[PDB]
Symmetry: C2
Subunit: 209 residues, 2 copies
């Protein structure tokens, strides 16, 4: 009985990381075997290049960096497939969608080109998109000092997210992340239990193919 592949995507400061952590804790407390993953995974060789780039410690050509972000997902696919096959549900803080939305927010990058490297990755059984008005996001802190942490660029990434959400091949669920941490969590946890029950019924899919 395979585990589910659940991805959290969402706007800046909507709570992807907080909710991914809380979801894994709650699933495990409820007898599920669940584990957390995140992208970029900064621990690998490629992950360290990505981390240096995001911290502005290095500059990386845009196409190159896009492919490294994708390669960073592919290097974890053997682990991902192994875990799901063993019945372990995986909760993932950002995935290919952030990949496309962030590079797609740059000039002269078509969504089509941005999606290709990730075509064929393990397909999420559930993609949660945590929405929050910018006025509310602003109350959660200031912008970070990392790359891409500015409103103008975040807004172009958001437009790319909205295009990706028109894709009906994917089980997208909108989450109102403006509520309290606990309330948001309970909405996510219930959607997640539902997806875990049904994932055991159909084989793990392939993204964008």
């Amino acid at each position: 009985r395979r585990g589910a592949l659940i991805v959290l995507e969402g706007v800046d400061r909507a709570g992807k990381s907080t909710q991914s952590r809380k979801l894994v804790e709650a699933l495990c407390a409820a007898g599920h075997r669940a584990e957390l993953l995140r992208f970029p995974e900064r621990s690998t060789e490629i992950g360290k290049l990505l981390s240096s780039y995001l911290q502005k410690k290095s500059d990386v050509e845009d196409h190159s960096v896009h492919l490294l972000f994708s390669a960073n997902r592919w290097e974890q696919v053997p682990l991902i497939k192994e875990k799901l096959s063993q019945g372990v549900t995986l909760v993932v803080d950002r995935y290919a969608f952030s990949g496309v939305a962030f590079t797609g927010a740059k000039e002269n990058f078509s969504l089509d080109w941005c999606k290709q490297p990730d075509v064929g990755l393990p397909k999420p059984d559930l993609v949660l998109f945590l929405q929050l008005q910018l006025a509310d996001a602003a109350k959660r802190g200031a912008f970070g000092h990392e790359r891409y942490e500015n409103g103008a660029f975040q807004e172009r990434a958001l437009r790319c997210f909205h295009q990706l959400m028109k894709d009906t091949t994917l089980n997208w669920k909108m989450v109102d992340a403006s509520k309290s941490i606990e309330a948001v969590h309970e909405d996510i946890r219930v959607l997640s239990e539902d997806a875990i029950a049904t994932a055991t019924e159909k084989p793990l899919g392939e993204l964008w193919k």
Copy 2:
């Protein structure tokens, strides 16, 4: 008056590296400004990952390694465009075609998926393909100890090369690499002078788009 982008591709031991070196020397001796490049470019961070992989010092997931090879070309695009715009002809030992042919020789990799990461790279004005019968290749030494240096895999890569050569958007020229080093060189040098003269007439193209 822009320089030309000339790529050498070809079967194992056909002489890509010898002929790329000799071509640059001859062009420069004939008053052209020409410089040599090669892929993979093993000097960069990504290049070092690629080098370790090819030497079998590390294993890398197939999709990941494919994207690193492509990223390794993209990180040199700013240099490539800068040089060509300054009138410098670039002679390149392997390019995106080796990228697709080598990954495409592996099980479950479509040519379409393999090509996508390289879509949009600087388009070569001339792609030389050095052909040689395997009996002749065998006389040029033994196989190397690096990855992919075995006849069965080389033969599947060759089939992918033949599919890529049906692409009429590209200026493919077959070279009979079974001749002497000097004879092969003179065939390549003449094709190259012709392409250099005409490249100054049309803008640098985009590959596979």
